[PDB]
Each structure stands twice: as structure tokens, then as C-alpha cells.
Ligand binder design. Structure first.
Ligand SMILES: NC(=O)C1=CN([C@@H]2O[C@H](COP(=O)(O)OP(=O)(O)OC[C@H]3O[C@@H](n4cnc5c(N)ncnc54)[C@H](OP(=O)(O)O)[C@@H]3O)[C@@H](O)[C@H]2O)C=CC1
Ligand SMILES: NC(=O)C1=CN([C@@H]2O[C@H](COP(=O)(O)OP(=O)(O)OC[C@H]3O[C@@H](n4cnc5c(N)ncnc54)[C@H](OP(=O)(O)O)[C@@H]3O)[C@@H](O)[C@H]2O)C=CC1
Ligand SMILES: NC(=O)C1=CN([C@@H]2O[C@H](COP(=O)(O)OP(=O)(O)OC[C@H]3O[C@@H](n4cnc5c(N)ncnc54)[C@H](OP(=O)(O)O)[C@@H]3O)[C@@H](O)[C@H]2O)C=CC1
Ligand SMILES: NC(=O)C1=CN([C@@H]2O[C@H](COP(=O)(O)OP(=O)(O)OC[C@H]3O[C@@H](n4cnc5c(N)ncnc54)[C@H](OP(=O)(O)O)[C@@H]3O)[C@@H](O)[C@H]2O)C=CC1
Lengths: 348, 339, 348, 339
């Protein structure tokens, strides 16, 4: 009944450093949101407007972008008329983030993942950096939306959104820990290949990731099960696992085997997941009842799809859970989500 | 002294079996007949040329309308969908290798004996429970000549049972679960199409495809102390051969990875030599193609959590390694042959 | 200025026999049309409502159907509330087409492709059969939309929509013949694998199609270049070719080399194609100027996409043209189109 | 009598070259040095284990921090991105096999001679026109010891030139076009990523990928009568090795398929024995893996339209068959070695 303006949440100015699989999935995820607090104003692409526009528009995994993608001039593209600056520097110290008034950098290079490296963006003028990967520094806080994003504070200048596998695992591990308690467990992710692997046998520090990715099942170490304890500290020292990279281009599946404290059975485990999916983890955790295969989970927005018919309990307290995740697109929706959290908590 | 063998079902396992047999230094098996509905043209061609085994180095020829020859040795080719119609009495067949995936129960496999064979070796789990099952390196000393129909189990049970036997002896298994990440097989569809299993209906080279497995339960057929202790699942993936078992077990004796691996090495160097291998190099699936062992423990992947949760990862060539076990089990029947 | 009703074009009652790749692509193509003269009332699926609904909804090539797919009862599914009968007979003589008042059968089995076999549907009660494949009988008329569908007559009870490759070739061959004249030519299609090939080396009358399809380049004979003369009779005896099946699941590309009568150059050839694309072959023939790869042509509605930068002319009169086609989806749009022609010409 | 060889670039061609050389009965080549930036660990491992060639049967060992051994024969491993820094004077290197794809022009390849080598053989088309190009079976009799830098052309030109030589001799080529349906190579990306060529940027195992080829024009370097007569394109497809050339030519002499094939058989049985093969069996790409010839005409695919339009389809293992030609051309330099 009073004289007032309308509430304005402020949009933060975002730059994407590294316009790779995750950088380009992030842009399409953002562009498809009905409402956003993010204004993407800059992209660092070594190939300039030609490469940025082409690889944004045409995608072997996602299909052709329905949006109108145009080259505006020699340093701008537009997406449905919204212009975005293209910069091209390998050294973040050289990026114009002070001049462009950048609030948040999405670090999707896989290169600047510790405080010194990501901090170069802040030295260059940005206020905050969100690393799309596990941090290389123990003191960089890590967040998984659906698990611990309420512990985010505006006063963290550098943050990590963890790995795709940790974003799959941690929501349903949180449910297991809440309902049944975890003693210890192991995980194997059967994971699509990524650009870190080689197309044909070739140079790599990892002699297994050196091997032809579309021809092989390729074991590789993973920090993702240990990393769950960065977001669920009660799980410190309780989980470990491995990865098997296989000849698919996206979608992965986690197989977790945990010993729980409370004796249970498969229907009760699934009921705990369904309760979470319908409530506090809606949009992050899904329980799938149809008999599907990996490609059915392409471009799904949730972090975790429990394959309900595969849930198994052995000897009362050994619980096996199988969960699908689109390691590109679902993970990128979580990057958008965590960037939106930083916008919501931005301090005046 | 040698026994006369017919192969029924000249598919992936039937053809791997012939090439495995042909490469043996010494054998008590005389392969004399192959039932292939494509006749000499198809049998000769797919024996010689193989997308995963490569070209057979033997000279493969079409002799006449019902014989091929392999390095000069003639094999009769027959073509009947009905085993009752096969000439096994005429040809004095001792042993039928059942590689069709169809005649896997006691009535079905028994048709070969009705047609005149003496014994049938099913290259698969049997459907009914009174057909004895054997895994070479685990319980083949329990085979008896009086068994007219026997099973060599599945590829996954042949990989699992040898190293589960070691774990049970050394540490004691309380319970466990397994996943096999498994190459696609001919039961799955190339593009989405009719299948009684709606996941196996889906394009095999495009997908990770979950499917049931009987292999964790089947271990208890050859290792009775494992009754009720294991369960698991398969994930079929877009590779054409070589598979990998990931087993997680709770054990009685608290342990650590090096000690688990040491138990496997003792077995690989002794009583399971040739069946169980421990691999120390950092390899990938294709490196285990055409390996003769049933199981290759990937040593650097062994993990122990909380003292008594043991994770073991083991590779197996589900075509070639399994078919070497089929040859081995058939050789056992020859050694114990009486009548 | 007079008392009148509105014009009513009649919808023909359609049954799909063989709910395979082409049968299911046909249903989705039809369902996505803004306006149609086709009412799909029956599907013959050996697996009943469970298999028909599941494989309609979930598709490894097309992705998940956005439409609401439900099992209504033991012999009906619904798509966005529209109910469709599921029948399951291997012998078309046994299908209930008289009882269901079927106008047109889409024959997508690959089995009933000559007059006796397709004619079993007419004996069963249908009025017309459209074979989604080359006919096995020389006297069954063949049509390619964009080429000769004006020669269709209601009085043909059995018709063929030719093969996917002939639907790619014939529109742009028609342009070449019109503008430059064809002396003779050869073609190779580099073609996705199909369900006729084997997953691992296994039984087949064709010893090359016996071989593992996702591991190999697989030569196979093709009638598709000769078949162009069924729709363009001036080309009788002038074309032949081969197929190479490769490890992709859909989209194919035709490489045609023709000797022409009129001396020409690449830009002039492409200009003839662009004139056709913009005019009489709009929606059937497309000229693509971007540097794309096979998966960019997935789910494209045209029959033919000329890769303009690959057009080459050697020695004045040897013309090489490269054209992309989605052998499942584009072909199925042409099946819908040819069925719509039969509806338009239906005689009162 | 033997010449001392260094391999610069231990990639697919560098490693195929070593295995091809090692399998020769007789050789005038002594491979003494390999430049691999991953050192002995990487060079030994990727030489032993290979996703398309399979495991090397030779004993491969790490001797010390700068030597491996292959069946006991030691090879020095060096690691410099800059050829000027390589120890070729110290090691008395005669011939460098340039397998990097980088030092393919006269300045770049010349750095190995500046560093002390006498001769460089580029395993690729050269970038500038005064580097002589040779295809074994076509023009290697034109090689001269006085040429310090030579090219062995591309895999596609090695497949094309031998049978184009036969067509030109027997029928006369007026003009023609070619497409190669070619396995992916390491220049392409695994998933969509940066590339100067926006089609080679795209996921290689998911796509048919058009790309330019110099091979049809390059035939005129080794066969001057072909100047200006051919053009063509490549389609990269999701297979890891083996490729196929489809050539369509207008010829002078009217002919028919059996006569074209007969010309190829005459050449395969005579002056191109070992380089050109004519295949009569109905095979697929994997059957031509690890074949030693440069070209396998698929006889049943030869087609003649309108009397003078000839279509020929020829298979080639773009890794192994090409590397056997690299070995052959290096052996020619050894036979003609003076100083
Ligand atoms: N793919 C996945 O499934 C997931 C990946 N991640 C993580 O996301 C990050 C990126 O992975 P992904 O997108 O797959 O890899 P890509 O290789 O596709 O993307 C990496 C991008 O960074 C660019 N880049 C590299 N170095 C620099 C530099 N110095 N300056 C500017 N741009 C640079 C590359 O371009 P150029 O070619 O110009 O170097 C490329 O565009 C990694 O940390 C990865 O671990 C996280 C979750 C899931
Ligand atoms: N592939 C693997 O990894 C393993 C498979 N197995 C088991 O081995 C068996 C065969 O498997 P695989 O070789 O992969 O399958 P394939 O489909 O390759 O071989 C099956 C063979 O049986 C033939 N066949 C089918 N029905 C009949 C019949 N009525 N009379 C005669 N021949 C017939 C088929 O020929 P046609 O085309 O003429 O029907 C084909 O040659 C199955 O039981 C399978 O579970 C066991 C371990 C591993
Ligand atoms: N795929 C392609 O790219 C193109 C294919 N075509 C043509 O379309 C036709 C179908 O090809 P495609 O869809 O790929 O093959 P599919 O194998 O996917 O579909 C064949 C369908 O017919 C069913 N079927 C077979 N026999 C019978 C029968 N007696 N009664 C009822 N249903 C039956 C099969 O089901 P079941 O498993 O129950 O037998 C299956 O659903 C073929 O003629 C093909 O040449 C044309 C253009 C392009
Ligand atoms: N593969 C094929 O089918 C054929 C390829 N070729 C030609 O052969 C050459 C190599 O091709 P391929 O073997 O496929 O490619 P690879 O990428 O497999 O091998 C290239 C090798 O060169 C090394 N290398 C690159 N730069 C340097 C450098 N500055 N100093 C030292 N080593 C270096 C790479 O190691 P690092 O990772 O350390 O850079 C890698 O080992 C190219 O010219 C190609 O066109 C010819 C015929 C056929």
C-alpha cells in the first residue's frame, strides 16, 4: 500500500575462460534458462570469432544450437542478438577484465586451477573465479549444489565446483549418510572419454590415457570419491575409487558400493532417494524407473539419475547404487547454478 | 585315444574354439564336423577372416559342397537347425561343443545324444540345475565321465571364480558385489530394434547398456562356500571383445592391497598358472586381446578400504580366453574318456 | 458472398507395417507436421504395446520423443493423447485392415516389397501400399518427391518411395541433367551402417555385410544409381555405383562423378543447385555453405544437402558433387510427403 | 655398408617404421637413435603396446635413462623439440626419418643436417617444391645420393600412384577425380575442439569428416604425365587404420572391367610385386590391416561406364603399408650411399 520500486537482483558480469566442452556447454545451459542473474559478456577463445561462433553453433554431442549465432565484428559474436566479446590471450594477466568490469570468471581451461593461476584473473581485474574442476589447492573451497552450497560465502574469491563424478556421487551419498550412515565404500565410474585422452596412441604423462580412446576401456585414477569429503566432511577417509573410460562421447555412470551402519534393503534405499528427489534435492537428484541406457541421459539437467532397478543390498549392510550423469551438460547446469549462487549472495 | 568332436554353432565361440584348438601343440581332440547353416561358403570365409582375431594363418579351403579343409585336414560341414537331424551316429561323434546359445537345457542338449553323440559340452551356463558346471582352475577335478551333458559356465564366471577362490582361501569372503564392464556381444542389437530385454534392444556401439548377469551367483556352483555371498550386474560398452570384472568383497581377515596381490601372484605362479595372471604394466583393454588366461588381475588397481573392503579389477578376453577354457574342458573329457 | 461450407481434404487412415528404424522415424516425422492429411491408426509391432511405446519414446539416434507416450491398454498406445492400435501378426493376410478401414499401409518391413507380398495387405483389406524401399517388381511404380511425384496416380495400388540414396541422388541429378545434360557417371555413397549388417562377424548372404559393422568400412552393392532411371527415364543405362558402409549410425554422403554435355565450372554447377533449392526443389534440395561434418545433418528434413565447397569440375565436363543425407530422418520425411500425395489425389 | 638411422618423431609412423624395420629379414639400416620427448618410459611403453598393431613380440626394455633395447639391441633416446640441439654429429647419424609432421620444409628438415646428419627422409609431402618426392614402385629409380632431403609422399599418394601408373600405361588417362575414405589420424580432435580446419576440429570417431587432400595432384610429382589431370577429396571416418581410394578416370582406350583388372594383375605379378596387390575375396577394411603392399585393388568393385569411365577401388593400410614404403625408400638410400 506504499510508494516503492520493484525488487532488483543484480546481474553479475561473467567471462568464460576456456571455451571448450565445459565452456560451450555452460553458455548453452545459461542461454536456455528462463531467468538468470548472469550476464555473459566475454569469452576467451584462441581461435577468435570464427572458431567461437562455429563451435558454439555446431556440436557433435549437443546438436546444432537453435539460437541465431552470428559474427558481429572482428571481436564480437552475438547469440540471438546478445553480443559477447571474444578475447584471445593465453596469459590471464593480459585479459582485459578491469576494463570490462568483470565480476566472475568461469575457469574452464583445466590450466588455472590453483590459487596462483586462478588468481591471475583477479590480478587482471576480475572479482571472483569459479573453477570448473577440482581445485589444485586444499584451501580453495569446493561446493556441490544440492549438498553444501549453503556454505558458500561472498568472501571466497576463488571456488571450485568439483568434478562431474563428485557432483554425481555427493548428492546420493548425502542421502545414504543421512538415512543409513556410511562405514566405508568404493566406487567405479564407467565414464565417457574426454579431451584429455588421445585419439590414437600418443604422448601422455598417463600411459593409459595415452591409448586410443574410442578403441579401449581405459582405467584411470580418480580423486572424485575422496573429494566427497570436501563437501561432506563426515566422509573423510571413508571412500575411494577408480575410473574406467569407455568409447562413448558423453554420459557416465557411477557404481558405488558402501557398507552402511543401518541394516536395510533395496526398496528402502530407493525410497530414501525418491524422498530426496521429490523434496530437498529436486532438480539435482532423479530416480529413474524405466529401463534406459546411457544415451537416454544425454542433456538431462539433474546431476544424478539413480537407476532404481539396479539398486542392490547384500548381507543387510552392503549397498550398491548405480547412477547416471551427463558429465558435460548436467555438470554445466551445476556450474550455472553455482554461479547463480554467487550472484544471489553478492555483497553490496 | 583322440575323441571325435562336432561343433554345433559356428559363431564367435564356435570359431574361436576351432582356432584355439588348432593352435594347440598337443591335443586329444579331433574336430571332424561343424554345423553351420551357411554351409562351406560361410564357414570357410568367416573362419579365415575375422574382425577381432585377424586373418587365420592356416590355409582354409572349400573341398566340396560339404567339406572344408584347414591346413589340409578335412572337416565335414552340416546344416540342420534341428540337432535330431544331425548325422552324429553315422560320423561316430564322441563330443558336441554346443555353441548355439539355443540347446542349453537338458532336453535341448540331449537331442545331440539322441542323434548319436555321446557327450555335450555347453559353452554357456546351463538352464536347468542338474547339468554339472565346471570352471578350469577351480573345480574341473570334479568332472566325471558319467556326466553326458556339462556346462563350462559363462566368460564372466570363468574370470571371477579363479580369483574369488584365492580370496576365499586367504581372507574369507563375507559378501560382495561385482560389476562387469563387458564388450558387446551378438545378443545385442546394432541399431535400436526388437529384443525381449529393452536395454539390449538399444544400439550396442553407441551405449553403455546395463544387463543382468548370473555370473556372481554361478560362482557358487563351482565354489560351494560362495553360496548366497555375491550378486552383481553387467554394463555392456562399445568395444568388440575384452571385458573387465570389478569385484568388491567384505573379507574376514583384515588386509591391505599388497598382501591381496601377493595371494594372487602365489596362485598365478603355482596352482593356477595359465588360468590366473597378475599384470603389473599399466595397460588397457586391447592389450588383453587373445590372451590365453581366464583372468588378468590389474595389480595397481587393487584397493582395500577400512581394512576389510577389498576391490579387485580383472581383465578377460571373453571370446578367446573363454574358448581356451572350452578347449581345456574338452581335453579333460578326452583324458577321462572310457565309454 | 454465398452460402457454403469450408473445404475439407479427407484424412486417409494409415497403418505402419514394420515399426523399425523407418517405421518409427516415419511416426515422429508425421507427428511433427503442423498440418497433415494422414491419420495413423495402427502399427504392427511384434513386441506389442510394451516394445512399441518404449522404442518410440527412447531412441539412440533421435533422442527422447518430447511427446507424451503412454500405454492405454493391452493393444493401444497413445501419443499426446492420440490413440493408436498395436497389432502383432507376421503374415499380413492376418492383419485386420478391413475391420479397421485402412486406406494406406506404410510397408517398412523390408520383407513385403513385391506385388505378391505387399498385395497381401490389400487382400487383408487395405486399399493402397507404399513400400519404404526399392520395389522387387519392375512394374511397381517408383517415386521421388521433388523429381517425379507429379506422375503419381490414384490408380496405382502399390508404389515405392525408392531407397534413401536414390532420394539423395535423384533431385540433384535432375538439376544436372536439365542444365548440363548427363553422358554417364558413377557414384559411391559413404553410408551409415543399418540393421541389415551384423554387430559382430556373423551369418549373412552377403559376406561383407556379415562383418562387424562398427569396426569396418564395408563395401556393398547398390541399385540406387541405376534406380535413378526409374524416376528420370532419360538416365537409363547412364549411372552406376557402389556403397561403403562405415561406423556411424545415421547420415550418409553421396559422391557423384558425371560426364556432362555442356562444358562448365564449379560455381556454375553450384548456381544451378542454388536456383533449384530456392525454387522448385525447396525443402528437398539444400545447398550448404558452412564447413560441416556428418552429424550436423542429423534430423535435417531435406533429401539432399550439397556440400558447395566440395563441388569440383575437371577437364570442363567431369563434374564431382558431394551431397549429405540423413538416411533415416530425411528419407522418412519423404515417405510422409509421398503418403500426403496419395491423400491429395485420393479419388472420390 | 649399413647406414646409421635416427627417427625424429616417435608417433604412429615413427613406431610403425621401427616395427616394420625390425621385422625385415635383411636390412642395410641400423636404427641407433629415437627422439621422443617422453623419454625412455614413453618410448618403450608405446613401442611394446599398440592399440592397432597389437603387442610387439620383441623384448622391449629400459636400459638406463637414455637407452631402450629391442631384443637386446640398444637404441639411444633423446628429447629435444629443436633439431639443432640433437646430437647427430656425435652419433655419426647418416639418415634422419622425419616423422614429426613439423620439419617438412627445406629450412626445417635442414636443421637435422646442421646438427650433423647427412640426409633426411620426410614421411610426408614436403612443403616446398624443390624437395624431391619418391613413391616406391613408381619412381624410386630416379633417387640420387646427392639429394640431402627427400619426401616419401603421403599414404594416399602411395596407394594411388602405383595403379594410376598402370592405368596411364595401358589405357591413357584424360582426367579424373578421387575420394579417399580414410581412417582418422592424430591431426583430428577426439571431441569438438580447436583446429585451424573447422571440420578436423570435430569429434573424429563420431563423424564423416571431409578434408582437402593433396594426393591427387601429388601424383604428378612422381608421374609427370599426370600433371593437371586429377583432383579429389578425403572423407575421414571412424576407423583407426586402413583407408580406401575410389578413383574415377576418363581413359583414352575404351575398355571393360575384366581388362582393367587384368592390367593390374600383370603389374602385381611382375614389376610391382610387393607394392600392388589384386584382391579377389570379398573383404572389409580390417582384413587389410598390417598388409605390406601399398595398394590392394578390390577386383570385384572395378566398374566401367560408357566404355571410357573407369572406377577403381583400392585399399591401403595408411600406417603399416606406408611405413613399409618408408623402410623401402630408406633402404634405397643405403644401397646408393656413397658419402
Ligand atoms: N568434459 C567433462 O566431462 C568435464 C570436464 N571438467 C573440467 O573442465 C575443464 C575443461 O575440460 P573440457 O572442457 O573437457 O576440456 P577442453 O579441452 O574441451 O576445453 C579446454 C579449453 O581451454 C582452452 N585453453 C587451454 N589453455 C588455455 C589458456 N592458457 N588460455 C585460454 N584458453 C585455454 C582450450 O582451448 P586451446 O585449444 O586454445 O588450448 C579449450 O578450449 C577441465 O578442468 C576438466 O577437468 C569438469 C567436469 C566434466
Ligand atoms: N561371445 C561371448 O563373449 C561369449 C558367449 N558365450 C556363449 O556362447 C554361445 C554362443 O555365443 P556367440 O558365439 O557369442 O553367439 P553367435 O551368435 O556368434 O553364435 C551363435 C551361433 O549359433 C548358430 N545357431 C543358432 N541357432 C542354431 C541352430 N538352431 N542350429 C545350428 N546353429 C544355430 C548361429 O548361426 P545362425 O546365424 O545360422 O543362427 C551362430 O553361428 C552363447 O550361449 C553365449 O552365451 C560364452 C562365453 C562368452
Ligand atoms: N534405415 C535406412 O537408412 C533406410 C531403410 N530403408 C528400408 O526400409 C525398410 C526397413 O528398414 P529399417 O527400418 O532400417 O530396418 P529395421 O530392421 O529397423 O525395421 C524392420 C522392421 O520390420 C519388422 N518386421 C520384419 N518382418 C516382419 C513381419 N513379417 N511382420 C511384421 N513386422 C516385421 C521388424 O520387427 P521384428 O524384429 O519383429 O522382425 C522391424 O521392426 C527396409 O526395406 C530398408 O531397406 C529405406 C531407406 C533408408
Ligand atoms: N598416420 C598416417 O596415416 C600417416 C601419417 N603420415 C605423416 O607422418 C607424420 C606423422 O604422422 P603421425 O605419426 O600420424 O602423427 P603423430 O602425431 O602420431 O606423431 C607425431 C610425432 O612427432 C612428435 N613431435 C611433434 N613435434 C615434435 C618436435 N618438435 N620434436 C620432436 N618430436 C616432435 C610427437 O610427439 P609430441 O607428442 O611429443 O609432440 C609425435 O610423437 C605427419 O607428417 C603425417 O602427415 C604419412 C602417412 C600416413
Amino acid at each position: 500500500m506504499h510508494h516503492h520500486h520493484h525488487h532488483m537482483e543484480k546481474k553479475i558480469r561473467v567471462a568464460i575462460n576456456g571455451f571448450g566442452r565445459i565452456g560451450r556447454n555452460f553458455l548453452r545451459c545459461w542461454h536456455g534458462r528462463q531467468n538468470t542473474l548472469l550476464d555473459v559478456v566475454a569469452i576467451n577463445d584462441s581461435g577468435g570469432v570464427k572458431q567461437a561462433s562455429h563451435l558454439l553453433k555446431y556440436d557433435s554431442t549437443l546438436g546444432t544450437f537453435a539460437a541465431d549465432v552470428k559474427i558481429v565484428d572482428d571481436s564480437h559474436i552475438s547469440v540471438d542478438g546478445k553480443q559477447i566479446k571474444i578475447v584471445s590471450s593465453r596469459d590471464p594477466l593480459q585479459l582485459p577484465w578491469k576494463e570490462m568490469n568483470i565480476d566472475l570468471v568461469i575457469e574452464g581451461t583445466g590450466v588455472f586451477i590453483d590459487k596462483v593461476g586462478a588468481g591471475k584473473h583477479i590480478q587482471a581485474g576480475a572479482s571472483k573465479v569459479l573453477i570448473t574442476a577440482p581445485a589444485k589447492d586444499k584451501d580453495i573451497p569446493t561446493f556441490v549444489v544440492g549438498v553444501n552450497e549453503g556454505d558458500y560465502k561472498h568472501e571466497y574469491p576463488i571456488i571450485s565446483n568439483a568434478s562431474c563424478t563428485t557432483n554425481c556421487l555427493a548428492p546420493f551419498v548425502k542421502v545414504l549418510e543421512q538415512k543409513f550412515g556410511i562405514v566405508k565404500g568404493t566406487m567405479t565410474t564407467t565414464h565417457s572419454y574426454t579431451g584429455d585422452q588421445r585419439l590414437l596412441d600418443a604422448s601422455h604423462r598417463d600411459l593409459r590415457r595415452a591409448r586410443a580412446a574410442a578403441l579401449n576401456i581405459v582405467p584411470t585414477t580418480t580423486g572424485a570419491a575422496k573429494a566427497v569429503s570436501l563437501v561432506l566432511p563426515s566422509l573423510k577417509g571413508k571412500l575411494n575409487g577408480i575410473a574406467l573410460r569407455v568409447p562413448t562421447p558423453t554420459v557416465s555412470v557411477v557404481d558405488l558400493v558402501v557398507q552402511v551402519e543401518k541394516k536395510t534393503f533395496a526398496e528402502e534405499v530407493n525410497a530414501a532417494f525418491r524422498e530426496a528427489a521429490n523434496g530437498p534435492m529436486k532438480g539435482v537428484l532423479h530416480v529413474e524407473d524405466a529401463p534406459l541406457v546411457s544415451i537416454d541421459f544425454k542433456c538431462t539437467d539433474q546431476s544424478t539419475s539413480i537407476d532404481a532397478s539396479l539398486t542392490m543390498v547384500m548381507g543387510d549392510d552392503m549397498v550398491k547404487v548405480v547412477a547416471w550423469y551427463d558429465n558435460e551438460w548436467g555438470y554445466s547446469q551445476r556450474v550455472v547454478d553455482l554461479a547463480e549462487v554467487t550472484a544471489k549472495k553478492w555483497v553490496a
